[PDB]
Scaffold this motif. Structure first.
Motif, PDB file in Angstrom:
ATOM      1  N   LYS A 186       0.790  -1.231   0.000  1.00 23.29           N
ATOM      2  CA  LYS A 186       0.000   0.000   0.000  1.00 23.29           C
ATOM      3  C   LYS A 186       0.827   1.289   0.000  1.00 23.29           C
ATOM      4  CE  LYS A 186      -3.528   2.504   2.665  1.00 23.29           C
ATOM      5  NZ  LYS A 186      -4.281   2.568   3.951  1.00 23.29           N
ATOM      6  N   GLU A 234       1.507   4.553  -2.755  1.00 28.64           N
ATOM      7  CA  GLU A 234       1.398   5.966  -2.408  1.00 28.64           C
ATOM      8  C   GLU A 234       2.668   6.702  -2.842  1.00 28.64           C
ATOM      9  OE1 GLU A 234       0.388   6.654   1.754  1.00 28.64           O
ATOM     10  OE2 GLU A 234       0.666   8.820   1.434  1.00 28.64           O
ATOM     11  N   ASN A 274       2.765   7.390  -6.439  1.00 26.02           N
ATOM     12  CA  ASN A 274       1.812   8.399  -6.864  1.00 26.02           C
ATOM     13  C   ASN A 274       2.346   9.827  -6.793  1.00 26.02           C
ATOM     14  OD1 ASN A 274      -0.963   9.337  -7.584  1.00 26.02           O
ATOM     15  ND2 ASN A 274      -0.960  10.114  -5.474  1.00 26.02           N
TER      16      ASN A 274
END
Length: 235
Positions: free
Chosen positions: A30, A34, A37
């Motif tokens: 996860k 991030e 991104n």
């Protein structure tokens, strides 16, 4: 640019630091997404991201493996900003700056150890621990082809070198690290052109596995590594 643009860049870097702090094998997937991104926007942002990652790796060498995997993902997904041919191994901005940065940490961590070459004694012992953490992270990156042969040989050379000050009885964790690196990168480094150098390394290793100055575990770890090479690293 503007002052706000500078503020935007600085807030991203504070965010990257937070992400790295709470990075765990369980949260990897996860947090990794991030980081992808917001940390691949441009060359400038890539430079900071790399600086922070290597920063954290040397603070928690236990997670070298984890951080090395994070570098792999970024190397493959981050867009190129430099100005190759089809079939050629990929070459990009990220990959180039990563190699450059580790060369830098290696030189600075080396200088910190030979800074004395009382209280100063405790300082040297801490720098000696940072150097090992640095080498372990390098090993993990080499395993994923993120750094080259030259720096790996440089790590091996420093670990086998016998300083006048240090005594043979105090090279346990240094020799233990060497066997780690050797089991991780040894096979890919041991090709025909390198026969001479590697032969030289393992001779030095054989003349230490029977030393009465080294613990039992250490000389048994050397014997197991040597035997693996004599078997052409074949399982």
């Amino acid at each position: 640019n503007s002052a706000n643009e500078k503020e935007r860049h600085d807030a991203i870097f504070r965010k990257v630091r937070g992400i790295l702090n709470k990075l765990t094998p369980e949260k990897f997937d996860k947090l990794c997404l991030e980081l992808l991104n917001v940390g691949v926007e441009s060359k400038l942002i890539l430079k900071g991201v790399i600086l922070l990652i290597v920063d954290k790796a040397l603070e928690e060498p236990k997670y070298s493996s984890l951080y090395a995997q994070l570098c792999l993902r970024l190397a493959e997904d981050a867009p190129n900003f430099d100005g190759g041919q089809p079939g050629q191994k990929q070459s990009t901005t990220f990959r180039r700056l990563l190699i450059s940065k580790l060369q830098d940490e290696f030189e600075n961590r080396t200088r910190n150890v030979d800074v004395y070459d009382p209280e100063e004694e405790e300082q040297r012992a801490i720098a000696k621990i940072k150097m090992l953490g640095n080498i372990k992270f390098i090993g993990e990156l080499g395993k994923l082809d993120l750094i080259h042969e030259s720096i790996l040989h440089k790590c091996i050379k420093t670990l086998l070198e016998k300083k006048k000050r240090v005594q043979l009885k105090d090279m346990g964790e240094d020799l233990e690290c060497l066997c780690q690196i050797m089991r991780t990168v040894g096979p890919r480094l041991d090709h025909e052109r390198a026969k001479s150098l590697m032969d030289q390394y393992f001779a030095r290793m054989c003349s230490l596995m029977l030393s009465k100055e080294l613990p039992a575990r250490i000389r048994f770890l050397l014997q197991d590594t040597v035997e693996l090479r004599e078997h052409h690293w074949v399982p």
